[PDB]
Amino acid sequence: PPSRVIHIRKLPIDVTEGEVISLGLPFGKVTNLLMLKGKNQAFIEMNTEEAANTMVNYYTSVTPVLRGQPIYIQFSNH
Amino acid sequence: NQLRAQXALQXVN
Ligand SMILES: [N]
């Protein structure tokens, strides 16, 4: 189901907090963030689930890329 | 830490 928080995998090794935040900015306010640099993943929480919808939809047509490397994004169990 | 999240969250917000 669509949820506020979006799980993110295959992130670069030195990926800055800033960069993961700048992923959902085009679609709304980012309210919270947990990075797992140990598994190269992160979580990102948006104000509205509806922003998290426009998120995944867009990044299903446009590759979600952080500095030349693409990443894999998906909804979560929030 | 949760430190660097929040400061960077705040910069934007
Ligand atoms: N902000």
Author numbering:
A (entry chain A): 56 to 133
B (entry chain a): 143 to 155
Task: Pull text from the paper.
One of such splicing factors is polypyrimidine tract-binding protein 1 (PTBP1) which regulates a distinct set of splicing events by binding to polypyrimidine rich sequences found in introns. A unique α3-helix is found in the linker between RRM1 and 2, which can be considered to be part of RRM1.
To validate the interaction of the stapled peptides with RRM1 we attempted co-crystallization of either peptide P-2 or P-6 with RRM1Δα3. Additionally, polar interactions between E72 (RRM1) and R146 (P-6), the carbonyl oxygen of V85 (RRM1) and N155 (P-6), and side-chain–side-chain interactions of N87 (RRM1) and Q148 (P-6) are observed. No significant conformational changes were observed in RRM1 upon binding of our stapled peptides in comparison to the RNA-bound state. Since the peptide does not obscure the RNA-binding site of RRM1 we hypothesize that the stapled peptides block the correct orientation of both RRMs for high RNA affinity. To this end, we synthesized a set of hydrocarbon stapled peptides that mimic the helix and identified P-6 as a potent inhibitor of RNA-binding with a Ki of 9.3 μM.
